[PDB]
Design an enzyme around this catalytic site. Structure first.
Site, PDB file in Angstrom:
ATOM      1  N   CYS A 197     -40.853 147.197  46.274  1.00 20.44           N
ATOM      2  CA  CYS A 197     -39.659 146.802  47.005  1.00 20.44           C
ATOM      3  C   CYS A 197     -40.049 145.934  48.212  1.00 20.44           C
ATOM      4  O   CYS A 197     -41.013 146.248  48.927  1.00 20.44           O
ATOM      5  CB  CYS A 197     -38.892 148.038  47.474  1.00 20.44           C
ATOM      6  N   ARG A 227     -39.377 133.366  45.230  1.00 25.16           N
ATOM      7  CA  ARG A 227     -39.180 134.386  46.246  1.00 25.16           C
ATOM      8  C   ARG A 227     -40.487 134.581  47.002  1.00 25.16           C
ATOM      9  O   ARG A 227     -41.541 134.770  46.385  1.00 25.16           O
ATOM     10  CB  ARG A 227     -38.730 135.703  45.606  1.00 25.16           C
ATOM     11  N   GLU A 255     -41.674 136.152  42.423  1.00 27.97           N
ATOM     12  CA  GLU A 255     -42.153 136.360  43.783  1.00 27.97           C
ATOM     13  C   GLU A 255     -43.675 136.273  43.859  1.00 27.97           C
ATOM     14  O   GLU A 255     -44.360 136.273  42.840  1.00 27.97           O
ATOM     15  CB  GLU A 255     -41.630 137.686  44.332  1.00 27.97           C
ATOM     16  N   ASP A 315     -39.560 139.844  38.828  1.00 29.84           N
ATOM     17  CA  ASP A 315     -40.713 140.351  39.563  1.00 29.84           C
ATOM     18  C   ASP A 315     -41.717 139.225  39.763  1.00 29.84           C
ATOM     19  O   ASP A 315     -41.406 138.223  40.401  1.00 29.84           O
ATOM     20  CB  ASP A 315     -41.320 141.612  38.938  1.00 29.84           C
ATOM     21  N   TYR A 334     -25.925 139.504  39.443  1.00 26.03           N
ATOM     22  CA  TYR A 334     -27.357 139.703  39.591  1.00 26.03           C
ATOM     23  C   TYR A 334     -27.820 140.954  38.841  1.00 26.03           C
ATOM     24  O   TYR A 334     -27.181 142.010  38.899  1.00 26.03           O
ATOM     25  CB  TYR A 334     -27.673 139.896  41.069  1.00 26.03           C
ATOM     26  N   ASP A 341     -33.872 139.182  38.157  1.00 24.61           N
ATOM     27  CA  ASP A 341     -35.121 139.522  38.814  1.00 24.61           C
ATOM     28  C   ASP A 341     -36.226 139.636  37.758  1.00 24.61           C
ATOM     29  O   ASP A 341     -36.150 140.492  36.879  1.00 24.61           O
ATOM     30  CB  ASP A 341     -34.918 140.814  39.614  1.00 24.61           C
ATOM     31  N   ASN A 349     -31.200 138.206  51.330  1.00 22.50           N
ATOM     32  CA  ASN A 349     -31.081 139.462  50.616  1.00 22.50           C
ATOM     33  C   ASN A 349     -30.536 140.544  51.544  1.00 22.50           C
ATOM     34  O   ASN A 349     -31.282 141.145  52.307  1.00 22.50           O
ATOM     35  CB  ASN A 349     -32.417 139.871  49.990  1.00 22.50           C
ATOM     36  N   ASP A 396     -39.734 151.479  41.230  1.00 21.44           N
ATOM     37  CA  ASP A 396     -39.759 150.025  41.293  1.00 21.44           C
ATOM     38  C   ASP A 396     -41.167 149.557  41.636  1.00 21.44           C
ATOM     39  O   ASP A 396     -41.411 149.116  42.754  1.00 21.44           O
ATOM     40  CB  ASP A 396     -38.694 149.482  42.258  1.00 21.44           C
ATOM     41  N   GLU A 430     -37.230 136.719  51.490  1.00 19.20           N
ATOM     42  CA  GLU A 430     -37.116 138.165  51.439  1.00 19.20           C
ATOM     43  C   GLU A 430     -37.370 138.758  52.822  1.00 19.20           C
ATOM     44  O   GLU A 430     -38.396 138.474  53.439  1.00 19.20           O
ATOM     45  CB  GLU A 430     -38.065 138.747  50.389  1.00 19.20           C
ATOM     46  N   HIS A 477     -35.540 134.884  39.588  1.00 16.01           N
ATOM     47  CA  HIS A 477     -36.382 134.836  40.765  1.00 16.01           C
ATOM     48  C   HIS A 477     -37.723 135.500  40.487  1.00 16.01           C
ATOM     49  O   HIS A 477     -37.799 136.581  39.895  1.00 16.01           O
ATOM     50  CB  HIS A 477     -35.654 135.314  42.040  1.00 16.01           C
TER      51      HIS A 477
HETATM   52 MG    MG Z   1     -36.738 143.474  42.530  1.00 14.35          MG
END
Ligand code: MG
Ligand code: CL
Ligand code: CL
Ligand code: CL
Ligand code: CL
Ligand code: MG
Ligand code: MG
Ligand code: MG
Lengths: 287, 288, 292, 291
Positions: free
Chosen positions: C123, C157, C115, C88, C45, C86, C209, C59, C187, C113
């Site tokens: 986060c 996600r 989201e 985002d 990952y 990832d 996760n 982040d 998540e 993924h």
């Molecule tokens: Mg992330």
């Protein structure tokens, strides 16, 4: 040499009347422009996207533009103005964009007051952020920029909100820290003298073809108080036509004979690159 | 298509007589070539250097070329031939170059038998590695390449060692695993039929301007046994002239009026990009 | 012999199917990916937070496709182990998402993924998250599926549990599967009893996760599998240990003027050579220098 | 900490004011931040690090772009002067020139370039091959011809293990003559070599305190007393990082959970501290409290 890129740009704006800024899509084009005698060059956002085969729809990110800019500034110290659209994101992205552009030896950027999913300034259906949101953008940029580095705030507001509201925006933008103003797609040259007087800071006029603006001359625009004149895609458009023609020629005739007169010679290419100075040094090393 | 880039290139070589491969310096040029109907495109090493404002003197590295290649293959599935000079270093670099080019969806590469500090194949003062050193290069490449992916071994030996010695090299190169041969700067069309017969694998002729070669036609070259004809910089050279002219025009006249007839129109540009399909979808999103 | 002829997407799907559950470990760079491979993990990952943090950025959605793409390419160049990346919220609108998908595929990535947060994301275990409505996320998913190959895995996600609660989250996930998502990333589910109901409703494989210092207790792989979970993610675990170790070495060198105290905490040159296969290369290099 | 000074100047000043200057390797920007937080005055990008982190051996496979990209990421995050390993210069005179120009453009403080042949190796390994003194002078000329004044060119000699101390000092002296600012004395096996080396070359000397090589680990103080001005810790942190990472992976594999690893992890809050994360997320909540 020991003058900063920002300073070189400010000096070109001051000493030229007006400063013609020509678009170059790559380093070699920048060299051609330099050879012809221009004092400033430009990296077109639309150019960056189009050259990758993408539409000018804010698909590109800081890295697409930054990579193109770096390639240019590596080849010439001629001050470069870079299109950064709406800043590629929020306050933090804008800060990154500014820092990175400075690190790439860029002289100036332009950032505009459209919404995130932006488009060409001469197209219909543009949407603007309110004055406050643009001030926010400008603050994020000025907070991290060096003094010499030039932030040009671009307003796309004329066609939507009219001259008076556009001057208001520009003035707030200068107040918020913008160094210069990019008055996008003013349709009449008689608008400029009143615009330029009100905003005080140097003003850029965008002389793009096939848009909503007539093509005035540099002299005319200077007489109306304009300090910079931009030719964003002019060379690129000619380049594309020339390329297509060569391809058609090769396809139809099985040979490029007909195209030869339309090609820059090997020797002219060598001249622009300084090729001989290098190959001579290479032969001295081989003996 | 669900056929690999290497396979598409091999198929274009087989079905065309001969296959014309045109140079493109960027993705948009690749699109223009595709629109005109070419079956294969080319990334010129000299182009890569020159566009950065550098001489074609082996200064560029895998990354300079790889970046330009990626941009092109992102925009078109048209099989792309990529100039990788002498492989950018030793056996391990060559291996990396091959793997990376494959990963970038490239169809074929050409690697040549010059020394590290290489030059344009139509310039004087070229230096070659011996046959053994080039075989080493080819082994490093073939050891890691997929089957479909096309390795074209290029020999720059004609101008230095003459036709017979050049054919010898090419034959050893095919033996070492080269798929096709790039016969650089053969000065006379009568050289080709003997060259092509001896090496057996498809042969590329490099029809670059302002070099040591006359410009023969595709038909002529096909009749002499040539399977691919390369136009490495043709469009680029025209592009540069056109650009310089626009710049001169704007400088001299304070306006670009004189240049307008020499510009591709906004609408033709939109056509090549499919711009309208995107901006229409954008207006439908703003209406919701 | 699977690594050779199978697409990255297929390798990932196969790892999800054959493992119970599939443990996916975060790696910030190619070398870490190699360590994970050596230990025997079946999937790796690339953490978006990792990508930002390693550059010294928060982040907070500052990173773009290129920041992530470059890190991904470096990894996939070094290993065929299927990689989950990832992305985002997709880095922009429909066209950017399409570009992200195409580019990730071109980089030999196995899965991504995406989201349902707003552009300026955070986060998933922090408070104050803002979501887009179900419709906007479906739009995102459509943009992605419209351009993706079959084998390539799109994991939708949802960050909705902490904001809207389990029922509303299951609704979202189900709409997302309908819109074309292959798998679901649930998540920050706070309680292991949430999973069996979640997994049954969405039908497609579900990722849990297991990040540290979050809103989740650290359950075991076995436990999560028993509750219907098919993938368990360890997004930053190695990275966090790496940082502590690095800081300690720096402190040691600063305080003592030498790294003696740190030696026991260092991987040996020989173990490094083993992971890299260094000897196979330097041997070939000496054989080349001997005939010349 | 005030930044009207060029990166080269900051590095020269750190060499002068520290006794000696400890330069620690960082493989990425975050590590550079950790080093800065601990109080180091200079940082280092290891060429071997660049290759190894990509999963490649340290065998000159990497090119200017591999190194340049890693350097840019670091200098974006900190003004702390950075020393960058550029191997043998990635090619001929023109490549070297490009390397220098690009490194300067990337806000790098200093580079080190060495006298090995193109297909180079770790300086503590057997079977190294050198170019003659003339070829290295050529390399140095190409670099100095294009570099700014403040920017630091460190010539590295790998000659001790092959040609012995006397021949190595000769090389170093020619190198300084050709324009090198400082000297990297690779893999001197005995601390008694340094005082004679340092006196002969005159310019600041770097000692490479790498682990698991041909050198004992002396202290900074010791090396300073023997005339050394810079001490390099090229991979120290990286080696610890790798062990830590492997351990976490083993833990997760064996136990199906990372509980045992928790004590060995930097905390979320410490991470936030290094990044200044809270200052950003707070500004983000104040922006959301209007919309
Ligand atoms: Mg992330
Ligand atoms: Cl320059
Ligand atoms: Cl495509
Ligand atoms: Cl691999
Ligand atoms: Cl900073
Ligand atoms: Mg634009
Ligand atoms: Mg070439
Ligand atoms: Mg090194």
């Amino acid at each position: 040499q020991s003058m900063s890129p920002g300073k070189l740009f400010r000096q070109a704006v001051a000493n030229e009347h007006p400063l013609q800024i020509v678009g170059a899509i790559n380093a070699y084009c920048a060299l051609l422009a330099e050879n012809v005698g221009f004092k400033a060059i430009y990296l077109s956002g639309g150019g960056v996207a189009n050259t990758l085969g993408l539409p000018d729809l804010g698909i590109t990110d800081l890295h697409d533009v930054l990579e193109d800019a770096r390639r240019i500034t590596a080849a010439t110290h001629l001050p470069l103005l870079v299109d950064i659209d709406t800043g590629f994101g929020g306050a933090f992205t804008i800060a990154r964009a500014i820092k990175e552009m400075e690190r790439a030896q860029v002289a100036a950027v332009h950032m505009e007051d459209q919404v995130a999913q932006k488009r060409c300034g001469h197209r219909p259906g543009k949407e603007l952020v309110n004055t406050n949101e643009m001030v926010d953008r400008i603050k994020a940029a000025v907070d991290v920029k060096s003094n010499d580095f030039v932030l040009i705030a671009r307003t796309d507001a004329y066609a939507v909100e009219g001259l008076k509201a556009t001057i208001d925006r520009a003035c707030t933008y200068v107040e918020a820290g913008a160094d210069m103003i990019f008055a996008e797609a003013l349709e009449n040259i008689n608008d400029y003298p009143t615009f330029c007087k009100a905003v005080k800071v140097p003003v850029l006029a965008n002389m793009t073809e096939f848009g909503k603006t007539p093509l005035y001359t540099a002299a005319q625009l200077a007489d109306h108080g304009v300090k910079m004149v931009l030719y964003p895609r002019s060379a690129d458009r000619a380049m594309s036509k020339a390329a297509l023609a060569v391809y058609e020629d090769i396809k139809k005739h099985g040979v490029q004979t007909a195209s030869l007169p339309f090609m820059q010679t090997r020797e002219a290419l060598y001249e622009v690159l300084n090729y001989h100075a290098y190959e001579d040094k290479l032969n001295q090393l081989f003996k």
